[PDB]
Amino acid sequence: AIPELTKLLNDEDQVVVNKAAVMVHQLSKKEASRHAIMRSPQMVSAIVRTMQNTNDVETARCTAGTLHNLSHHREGLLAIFKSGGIPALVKMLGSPVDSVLFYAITTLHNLLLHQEGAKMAVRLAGGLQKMVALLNKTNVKFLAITTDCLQILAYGNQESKLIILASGGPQALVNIMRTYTYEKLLWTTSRVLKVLSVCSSNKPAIVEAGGMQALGLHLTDPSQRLVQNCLWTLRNLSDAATKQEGMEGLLGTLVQLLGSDDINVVTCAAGILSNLTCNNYKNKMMVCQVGGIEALVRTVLRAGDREDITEPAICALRHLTSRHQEAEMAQNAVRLHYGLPVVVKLLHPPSHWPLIKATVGLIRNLALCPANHAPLREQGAIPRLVQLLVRAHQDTQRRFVEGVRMEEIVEGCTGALHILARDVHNRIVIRGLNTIPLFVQLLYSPIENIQRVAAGVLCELAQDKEAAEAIEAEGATAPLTELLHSRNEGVATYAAAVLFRMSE
Amino acid sequence: XILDXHLXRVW
Ligand SMILES: OC[C@H]1O[C@H](O)[C@H](O)[C@@H](O)[C@@H]1O
Ligand SMILES: OC[C@H]1O[C@H](O)[C@H](O)[C@@H](O)[C@@H]1O
Ligand SMILES: OC[C@H]1O[C@H](O)[C@H](O)[C@@H](O)[C@@H]1O
Ligand SMILES: [Cl-]
Ligand code: NA
């Protein structure tokens, strides 16, 4: 039966070929005759050739339908692959007949899912460009299959990601997220955007297409798989969304999600908020206005020693406690929502270096508010900051530990101490811990930012006569005179102030 | 019909 029809498929008369195509299709519908077609590598080559070369609507439907039935089995998937069926199927994607299109996209889906070598074959056949072009179709079930194909092709393949970008992929995918409500489609499209959102080229494009706001629409959808993929993609994109506006709604939802029972939801919300509030005074304002400080302190308390939650949450708190209209109110709110004890706790083991760095920065900002000077002292912040500083300095003098340079710890701790030293009782504590020798040694640091905070803390201390004499006794006049000529105006200003107080 | 059938099979 099989070689008879293979001879009729290779006929010079196309009429004979058309009649043979309808017969081969009906045979693919039964299991006995289907395995017969799959066992013959000469029959499968004829079906592929018939499909690619036919100009007849029915023959294209029957040859594509036949190949679809083979794709249900491992033997048939291997047959279509070895018979060069992938480029033939790709050609069928330009078909104005829906039934031909639906056979091709589903067969290609099956090949991409279970057949080795198929992802490379589809790329080489120009499949990516054809698939991106079809994203203007309005059938949500077809769109769901097409987008899933793009996900398979883009995953772990920076080449494919770049092609999707060039073909207007980001804009088309964002449109789907703004236009449809069909969950299965929203979810598959969000998975494509997730894959693309780790690409340094695709990321600014997705953000420019309005991807942050589009993904924000679906954060309260009942579907948890859709919410989570939106959250992952949002986190990936969030470091490139600094200039975006129309973010009020997203920012409000993210604060709400901080109270979620899902730790993955909490982690992502904290991380997105952290990125979006980094040096964006308008976003800082919005997050504070919708109860962001309270939400973040509660998050830090509940998270305990889970640093995947506390690190982004503490970073967000650091951003929200400086350089915006409501910064003062936020500094106070951290105290009023019982946050100061837990913030000091995070300076201690088992906290790793990324979290310690963030916590020190937050304490530095908290100390800008005088009402936090005494509670920070009472909660034990000064001795721990000094211990951190002393050891960090030693580590630099001997020589990235957990991605963090110990210079960053020196600068951070000295900076926090510089701000805490505005209070008279804090200066007593700082001086009593024998810090002046270390602060004077820091004047000789190659790093200008360290010289600035070291000079600043010495400047605060020297306002008390006893401390000024100790600073002088440490031979500080020599480094300080040299620092008067620093290209850093902050260093030079502070050095002059210390020298002044040492001369009376 | 092919679409419904395929959706069910895959997901
Ligand atoms: O994470 C999703 C990915 O999982 C696996 O790597 C599959 O091979 C790939 O097709 C899929 O896109
Ligand atoms: O779901 C797999 C991964 O998706 C995204 O790339 C997220 O950024 C990452 O945190 C997650 O683990
Ligand atoms: O609190 C307002 C300002 O106080 C101090 O001048 C700090 O040096 C500065 O960083 C802060 O922005
Ligand atoms: Cl301590
Ligand atoms: Na700052």
3-state DSSP of A292-341: HHHHHHHHHHHHCCCHHHHHHHHHHHHHHCCCCCCHHHHHHHHHHCCCHH
In chain A, which residue's Cα lies nearest the Cα of B3? A141
Alpha carbons A431 and A382: distance in angstroms, whole number: 11
- Torsion angles phi and psi, residue A210, rounded to 5: 90, 30
Which residues 88-107 on chain A approach chain B with CB closer than 8 angstroms? 99, 102-103, 106
Contact (Cβ atoms closer than 8 angstroms) between residue A134 and residue A172: no
For ligand 3, say whether the CB of A368 is within 6 Å of any of its atoms.
Answer: yes
Alpha-carbon distance A412 to A385, whole Å? Answer: 9
Environment class of A446 (CB within 10 Å of its CB; exposed 0-12, middle 13-18, buried 19+):
exposed
Q: Provide DSSP, A405-473.
A: -HHHHHHHHHHHHHHHTTSHHHHHHHHHTT-HHHHHHGGG-S-HHHHHHHHHHHHHHTTSHHHHHHHHH
B2–A103 CB contact, under 8 Å: yes
d(Cα A497, Cα A458) in Å, to the nearest integer? Answer: 9
Q: Which helix (H) or strand (E) holds A36?
A: helix A31-39
Q: Is A191 in the pocket of ligand 2 (CB under 6 A)?
A: no
- From the CA of A195, give the closest atom in ligand 2: 6
Residue that is written with structure tokens 């630099």 in the block: A396
d(Cα A69, Cα A59) in Å, to the nearest integer?
15
Sign of CA pseudo-dihedral A385, A388, A391, A394: negative
| Sign of the C-alpha dihedral computed for residues A39, A45, A51 and A52 taken in this order | positive
**A501 C-alpha to ligand 3 centroid (Å):** 22
Beta bridge mates, A263: none
Per DSSP, what are the bridge partners of residue B4? Answer: none
Q: Note the CATH number of domain A245-370.
A: 1.25.10.10
A473 φ, ψ (degrees, to nearest 5)? -60, -25
Q: How far apart are CA A166 and CA A324, in angstroms?
A: 39
Backbone phi, psi, residue A401, to 5° = -80, 110
> What is the sign of the dihedral through the CA atoms of A211, A213, A216 and A221?
negative
Question: Which-ligand-closest: CA of A190?
Answer: 2
Q: Which residues contact A144 (CB under 8 A, 6 or more apart)?
A: A182, A184, A185, A188, B7
Contact between chains at B3 and A109 (C-beta distance less than 8 A): no
Residues 6+ apart with CB under 8 A from A311: A354, A355, A358
Q: Are A116 and A80 in contact (CB under 8 A)?
A: no
Sign of CA dihedral A298, A299, A305, A307: negative
Q: Dihedral (C-alpha) A330, A336, A342, A344: value to the nearest 10 degrees? A: 70
CA–CA gap between residue A247 and residue A257 (Å, rounded): 15
**Counting Cβ atoms within 10 Å, is residue A473 exposed (0-12), middle (13-18) or buried (19+)?**
exposed
DSSP single-letter state for residue A239: G
Query: Is it true that the peptide bond before A350 is cis, omega within 30 degrees of 0?
Result: yes
Taking an 8 Å cut-off on Cβ atoms, the answer to whether A68 and B2 are in contact is yes
**CA–centroid distance, residue A43 to ligand 3 (Å):** 80
A137 at the B interface (CB within 8 A)?
no
Q: Give the experimental resolution in Å.
A: 2.1
Distance A94 CA to ligand 1 centre (A): 26
Tell me which amino acid residue A246 is.
G
**What are the backbone dihedrals phi and psi of residue A73, each rounded to the nearest 5 degrees, phi first?**
-125, 150
Q: Smallest CA–CA separation between A80 and chain B, in Å?
A: 18
Q: Which chain B residue lies closest to A68 (C-alpha atoms)?
A: B2
Which tokens sit at A212?
Answer: 């942050």
CB-based contact A40:A75 (threshold 8 Å):
no
Q: List, comma-separated, the residues after which chain A is broken, a break being a C to N distance over 2.5 A; otherwise answer none.
A: 399
How far is the C-alpha of A179 from the C-alpha of A182, rounded, in Å?
A: 10
What sign does the CA torsion over A232, A233, A234, A240 have?
Answer: positive
Cα dihedral sign for A302, A303, A305, A311?
negative
Q: Which of A366, A320, A319 is nearest to A341 (CA)?
A: A366
Burial class from Cβ neighbours inside 10 Å (0-12, 13-18, 19+) for residue A503 reads exposed
- Locus of tokens 């939802």: A253
A190-226 core/surface letters (b: 16 or more CB in 10 A; e: else)? bbbbbbbbebeebbebbbebbbbbbbbbbbeeeeeeb
A411: CA distance to ligand 5 center in Å?
Answer: 13
Query: Could you please report the per-residue DSSP string of A354-411?
Result: HHHHHHHHHHHHHTTSGGGHHHHHHTTHHHHHHHHHHHHHHHHHH--BTTB-HHHHHH
Q: Which residues of B touch A141 (CB under 8 A)?
A: 3-4, 7
Q: Rounded to whole angstroms, how far apart are CA atoms A311 and A423?
A: 28
d(CA A11, CA A406): 78
- Write down the domain spans for chain A: 245-370
Q: How many CB atoms lie within 10 A of CB A267?
A: 22
DSSP secondary structure letter of residue A97 = S
The span from the CA of A16 to the CA of A27, in Å, is: 17
Q: Which two tokens stand for residue A410?
A: 């020196």
